[PDB]
Amino acid sequence: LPGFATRAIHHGYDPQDHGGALVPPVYQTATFTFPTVEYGAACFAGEQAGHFYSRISNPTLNLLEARMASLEGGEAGLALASGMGAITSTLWTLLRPGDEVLLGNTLYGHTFAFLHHGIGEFGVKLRHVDMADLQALEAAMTPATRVIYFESPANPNMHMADIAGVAKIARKHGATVVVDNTYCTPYLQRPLELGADLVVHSATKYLSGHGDITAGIVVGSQALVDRIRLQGLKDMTGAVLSPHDAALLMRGIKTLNLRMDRHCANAQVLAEFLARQPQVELIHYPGLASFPQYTLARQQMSQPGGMIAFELKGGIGAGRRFMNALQLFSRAVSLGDAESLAQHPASMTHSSYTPEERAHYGISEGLVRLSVGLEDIDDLLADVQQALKASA
Amino acid sequence: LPGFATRAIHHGYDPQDHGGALVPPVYQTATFTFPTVEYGAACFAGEQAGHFYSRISNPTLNLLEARMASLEGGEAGLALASGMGAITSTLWTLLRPGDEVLLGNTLYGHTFAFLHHGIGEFGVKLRHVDMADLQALEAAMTPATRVIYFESPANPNMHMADIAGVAKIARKHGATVVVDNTYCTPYLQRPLELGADLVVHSATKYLSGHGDITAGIVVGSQALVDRIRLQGLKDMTGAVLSPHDAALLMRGIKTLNLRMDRHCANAQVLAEFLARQPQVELIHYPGLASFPQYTLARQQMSQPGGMIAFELKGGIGAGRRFMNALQLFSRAVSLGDAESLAQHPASMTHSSYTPEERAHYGISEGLVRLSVGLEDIDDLLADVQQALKASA
Amino acid sequence: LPGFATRAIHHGYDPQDHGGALVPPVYQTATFTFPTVEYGAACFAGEQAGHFYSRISNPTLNLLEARMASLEGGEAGLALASGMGAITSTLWTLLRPGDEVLLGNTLYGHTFAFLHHGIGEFGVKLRHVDMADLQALEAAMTPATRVIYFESPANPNMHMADIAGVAKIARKHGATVVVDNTYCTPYLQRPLELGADLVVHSATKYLSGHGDITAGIVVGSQALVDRIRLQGLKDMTGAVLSPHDAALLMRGIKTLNLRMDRHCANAQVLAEFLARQPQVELIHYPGLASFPQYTLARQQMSQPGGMIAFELKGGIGAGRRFMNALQLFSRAVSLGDAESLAQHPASMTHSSISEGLVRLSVGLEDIDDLLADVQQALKASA
Amino acid sequence: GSNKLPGFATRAIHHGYDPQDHGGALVPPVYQTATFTFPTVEYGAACFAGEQAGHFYSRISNPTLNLLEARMASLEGGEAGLALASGMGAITSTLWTLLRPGDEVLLGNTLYGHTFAFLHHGIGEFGVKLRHVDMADLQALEAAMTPATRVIYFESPANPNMHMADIAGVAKIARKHGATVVVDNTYCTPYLQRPLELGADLVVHSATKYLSGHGDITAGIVVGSQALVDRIRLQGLKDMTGAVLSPHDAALLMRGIKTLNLRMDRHCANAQVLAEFLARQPQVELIHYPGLASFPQYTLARQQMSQPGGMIAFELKGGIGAGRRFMNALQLFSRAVSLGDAESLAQHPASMTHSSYTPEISEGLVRLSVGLEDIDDLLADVQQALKASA
Hints:
CATH architecture of the largest domain in chain A: 3-Layer(aba) Sandwich
Oligomer: homotetramer
Helix content of chain A: 25-40%
Strand order of the largest sheet of chain A: 1-7-6-5-4-2-3
PDB class: lyase
Order of helices and strands of chain A: HHHEHEHEHEHEHEEHHHEHEHEEEH
Number of helices of chain A: 14
CATH superfamily of the largest domain in chain A: Type I PLP-dependent aspartate aminotransferase-like (Major domain)
Largest interface: A-B, 76 and 78 residues
Strand content of chain A: 5-15%
Radius of gyration of chain A: 22 Å
Assembly: tetrameric
Largest sheet of chain A: 7 strands, mixed
Number of domains of chain A: 2
Shape of chain A: globular
Keywords: Pyridoxal 5'-phosphate, lyase
Chains A, B, C, D: L-methionine gamma-lyase
CATH class of the largest domain in chain A: Alpha Beta
Organism of A, B, C, D: Pseudomonas putida
Structural class of chain A: alpha/beta
């Protein structure tokens, strides 16, 4: 097996099959033709019996898919228009009325909204459990439990699950494990190598790395991915990825290892700095020894990531003032960009709501989330330092 | 006030507001930042109230949406990753278990599959009705009837619905009317002017015109479109359109009137040619006086369209031969491209599941569909001519 | 031979050669690799001996070139980063110190500047001649004359050259005739069929049609185009066209016939209208019966074009007021866009060519809207 | 405090752009427009009258290209930037602007092949006099200076041998005599070497190479004084080459520049490991890598370049049969004549670019552009290919 960086650059492509083109040509074409009629029917007989033919599919998307499957260590990939496209296409395929899905206690907002206000209104039953508590997960299992779905680390506090421990429970009961591996990327964590069946990504974030595309990825077995392609994507969401954007995503993936190394190195320094500041009450970073799941983080993730969450002593007011004071960090809801980003859900995504409603799965008044970018660490430190002064 | 071609080129954009740029810049950015968290908060708060906030949405997408709303004569537009993304985002928003949807008798294949194998398996009730039979439609209405959905013209015979008659019925019973207007485009037919509530498009086809993007559009009232944006798109499909592709779609729309004029002119010559030929049993072209719904077609459509369907004497084998002899027309499933396309579903989309399972009857068997392109009509005539000879 | 519209969509490409892709894939790659060193020796043991293989060249650019060569009825095509790229690559290849280039009396501004302040400052001799006056052109030929270069029609009055007449004169001296065919496009005029050796285009204008790319095209005989590729482009300008923009250009070309028909139809209406307005002193539109070169125009052009120039009676102030009143037409210097454009050089390009000269690039908008805009601007010009 | 220059990586990502001026867009929108319109006729006379007199007021300039230019200027420490369709576009637009018949240009002893061809068979055939001088020999340079010497032009390190020049030393001679110094900084990028900060007047790049980093665009950059860059814009580019860069490609070049520091660090780290490994292999006769003390200009390389680059040249024992066999055995390195890509590339000039000629550049010479792949995979490829050349 070539190394990760080699595979991120080369896997699945030989220039000699495309006239020597070092960079694969971009198939910006909505349709492909047939040499004869019966040739065209072999293709569409193939699908609907369950099988996926790679001509009649887009070679640009097929390469992205193959490369992502390689990096995750999985059999098959699927490229979609957004992370939400990946999540919905997957879950719409795998669940029907009467099935139960077991969920991590805290999810990305639109994932939560899709589950509770979307598929959960179509007869699918939902239950949240703490995926770190393997006792409680085992106790929540029923024979109708079809899917276990979580993020690790999860928003907001970077709470982790023991993926291999969850997978053991799933295997005993007969459930499918879907992990949103957006935060880590395959460079830091490979849930399929720990027993998960499927991984989903918002490739909009670190995989792209540059904030210029929206994309999703699914990786898993050929059997599952084919179903998600043929039903979830083709019939239930139509979340088709542009070949232009797939090509830009592959461009980003060529520097994934280098970018993640810098995101993590910057984040570790910033996290250690924040831990020593008088304005800061609590910090959630996997790379600090104080992190409650430090041991599990070191076992499951090869580096502690680019994401930091922390709480300011002065609560929502201090959070607002801190956020407003940032000059180099931008105020924005995304993550995994070259540019450093910050958000303070209490005064941003959840503002008109009351303090008591920010509670059950839970948003601290003072919780700030940082996506630590690729800028010079001294410039980022200076920005954070002044914004902490301004937070009082 | 301004004419269709003027609006397709200019609507919603003045260069003087973007530093004089004659062509609007392409916003290929996954996210937008906020000057304050309070500003950011106000955006997410009103989104949670059900209000869509233009700007802090993507200006490239917003311009495409405004321009399509203008061309269809609707209040609001929505851009999505594919036609299927348009259709699914709409139907997932409008329907819940217990609701019924009345459908046109024949549907595009993935639409059919979505309804019967997708949303229909989540407790939504389906019934097909002839949307030209207002008495059958009235009789099929129930208190659960929430949506009426069809294409006009519809495959394979270009069967027309009586859109104004359907809408009257829908308004009486409180149902929402959704029309897939892909075939005509707003240049030939505007279902919202006939009482439809929503129109959907595979912008992949004629709106693009050049077969290089995949895209969908919804146009209708602000109230309906806002729900579809905020629930169907954001939560249930994630079918997000690339700004690169949105810009190309706008580029295509600038010649829509010209292209549709030529598609219709060419198709009429080919249909009148086909009418005079001994190998042709039957032709479905709205512009021939013998088309069964010629008068209704003319009330709803300003020109008879770019699509022809015809049946060969000799059935499946004659079709197979016709298709394999074509040298200028390509064998492919799409439509609305500059390139002329043909398909014979009996031996392409539907060969392997063979003549017994084609128990639609009047639909299949010997039927060839032409998407008449923009090439020189004498070249297209010669190609059809020689393929007809080869069909014997 | 397939018809123009068929060739603009199909020429040079079969989907069956590229895995069925209806639209050809975009080769957005700077480099191409070799299967063995033996093979990669062939590709540079060949350009060194003046031979262009289609192997280390880009397939997207090659297809665009092939299609443009087909539309102009020439042997070979070359794609470049701009019309100025086409013009300079061509003239740098064909001229050396002491050579003479005979020029149409009026040229696009940057072409004029290139000639007078660029190549003309490196010892190349320039002379301007009326390319409709065949006796004057003949009397201007010298042994140094190596190239005859002009636009037809030319700014500001749409002055026409007699292309076949020029070619006949050139042939007696072996001189190379280069025609800038930007205004007409191959759909309206094909100078190579009238005896020119090379045509150049700012593909930025009508060929693209949509105002979103900058690009140039050269079409001509194989020997000349090869030298322009291997010397002018490769070594003297580096005016390399992006494969992305080449793909967009090909996209524009698929509707060239339909767009030109509408540009011409709209300009015909606006010219009939303007020609009888009180405020209008003179009008230059090839489709008007009273255009001085009506007959020659109709011999060379299948339609009279999308461009109109006219002169307002009230001079520079009238021109200014007209321009500032326009609400649908945009104030800009380009042409050949879907959007209608207007310029008044006396108050725009030339702060200090008539005082009242206005040029319209008539676009694809509804003619009733363009007429209303021009009408109210005319009233405001009083 | 606030008068501290932000770090190189911060500037490569942010310089020149605030999202709040473009409706919050985190990534700047792409101005894929050939033309810009005017609010009145007068606003437009002021722009066109200004460009004639010598000015680059933005002048209704393309904001995508302007941002790229300002960012490249910041990184090189220059006043102004200009973006063009290729490296040759940058080189030709620059030299066509600065030279006229009777002027002399002094040239480094080796040049990129198309640059050599432009000079000898292009501008040199229009009355511009050429002379080649070793730009590392400051005595020889001083002695070659004449009253007609208008431009001194060279690459450092030079294609293909990596010969270096003392840029500050050259600049000092040019100051005394009056010549304009133009340095092709392609190989190093501003991350490794900033010739303007050493006294050069202009720098040019094939941004096609490292600045892009991903082998998908062709592009050139010039950086220097506002006066010289404006002149080159308004004459060389606008009138003499038309080498216009696509806004689409300019945006991709900015995307590449956001990772320039990280990529250059990995190119150099990999090349150092590969150069140290190659130096110890039986079949390697000589190796030229700036980071090895065997490099003939080791101390000049250390002085001018913050890291020793991504390029290696070495000679195999066993001649052309060796090099030919080494090349054809490569399974991860590609056979290609380019550099600064994510993909590692190799060439053997004897069996490739100079194959048409006879031995009468050594016969076992190989040039490597070391990419971003895992070093263990690159070592294994080179090691198995050395076995096959044996």
